[PDB]
């Protein structure tokens, strides 16, 4: 199960 | 004992040669089970172990959504980095990330990870408390500050203690016959004259799972750390692994040297003499 949230630098 | 789930992803910018390629793979322990290739011509998260195909099409519909997402995110992050670092738009740069979790013998949560690396080197990573962040240089603190006003640790912490643990536990039942095995190493020794004064002794460990293993030589019970030649643990293909250790010894002294093997699937550690 992959991650749900992803952020920009 | 314990088990681990890992997803690793590499984005790589190719200026002029087109667009950032994005590759991602998943592991339970040391067995690869899913993948995604931005240049696949399928644009779907694919299976790589037999026991993940039993999952239905809504699974493949979902995971493909999460990992196409993240691919575009890092594709931009490659640009933000070339900004924060003042680099030219003709060079190739690499963005790498890993995340996952480790669980005990009971399936309880043990430790989680969430880290990034720019161009081979530590960039930012989540601490062990899963509360704070560890930036590696000035550019990553600009990002470290951003990610505390956003409470991103809160978010990632929620994934790790919940979704990450939940799904691993599921796969550990789906593939219990492949994933819960321990295969002990078959071990043999080899022997070869370099000159009329010396010979090589090579200690071989074949066909084991999982990958952890120790191979050490001794001379009269004394550790021979610096004259030992020790290769990286390597994959056999079928999902076992190999490793060997080698010493050069003087002709006629092969009896003082011994080679010790430790593994999960070995009750007692082994010892092998020529």
């Amino acid at each position: 199960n992959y991650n749900y949230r992803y952020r920009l630098f | 004992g314990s088990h681990s789930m890992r997803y690793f992803s590499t984005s790589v910018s190719r200026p002029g040669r087109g667009e950032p390629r994005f590759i991602a793979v998943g592991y339970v322990d040391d067995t690869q089970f899913v993948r995604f290739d931005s240049d696949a011509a399928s644009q779907r998260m694919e299976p790589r172990a037999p026991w993940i195909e039993q999952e239905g099409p809504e699974y493949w519909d979902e995971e493909t959504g999460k990992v196409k997402a993240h691919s575009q995110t890092d594709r931009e992050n490659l640009r933000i980095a070339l900004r924060y670092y003042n680099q030219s738009e003709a060079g190739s740069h690499t963005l790498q990330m890993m995340f996952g979790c480790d669980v005990g013998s009971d399936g309880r949560f043990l430790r989680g990870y969430h880290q990034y690396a720019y161009d081979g080197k530590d960039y930012i990573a989540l601490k062990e408390d899963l509360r704070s962040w560890t930036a590696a240089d000035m550019a990553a603190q600009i990002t470290k500050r951003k990610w505390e006003a956003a409470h991103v640790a809160e978010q990632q912490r929620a994934y790790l203690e919940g979704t990450c643990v939940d799904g691993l536990r599921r796969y550990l039942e789906n593939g219990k016959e492949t994933l819960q095995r321990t295969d002990p190493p078959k071990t043999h020794m080899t022997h070869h004259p370099i000159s009329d004064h010396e010979a090589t002794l090579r200690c071989w460990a074949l066909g084991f799972y999982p990958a952890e293993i120790t191979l050490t030589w001794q001379r009269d019970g004394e550790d021979q750390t610096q004259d030992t030649e020790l290769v990286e643990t390597r994959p056999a293909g079928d999902g076992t692994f190999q490793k060997w250790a080698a010493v050069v010894v003087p002709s006629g002294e092969e009896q003082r040297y011994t080679c010790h093997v430790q593994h999960e699937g070995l009750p007692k550690p082994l010892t092998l003499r020529w």
Partner: protein, 99 residues
């Protein structure tokens, strides 16, 4: 900034002449990821050669396995030829039946 690859050439099982095997080139610890691995039989490139999917280690270095079914015979010499930017000429490693 950039690390050279470590190259191992070997068979899945010890080399019985006339019994089918798998020839492996494992490459590990390199950076950047961009790399070329080729298998050679008595010099010539082996065509149908599969490889694993880009993965990396606890320390951000990359590894890859390149492989091909084959049957070792008495007169045949194999090798692995690795093309990476750290190398000025592609490094070639001969398959040694006891390595």
């Amino acid at each position: 900034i950039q690390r050279t690859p470590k190259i191992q050439v070997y068979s899945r099982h010890p080399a019985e002449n006339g019994k089918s095997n798998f020839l492996n080139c494992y490459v590990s610890g390199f950076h950047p990821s961009d790399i070329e691995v080729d298998l050679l039989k008595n010099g010539e490139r082996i065509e149908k050669v599969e490889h694993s999917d880009l993965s990396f280690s606890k320390d951000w270095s990359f590894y890859l396995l390149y492989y091909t079914e084959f049957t070792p015979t008495e007169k045949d010499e194999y090798a692995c030829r690795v093309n990476h930017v750290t190398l000025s000429q592609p490094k070639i490693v001969k398959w040694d039946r006891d390595m």
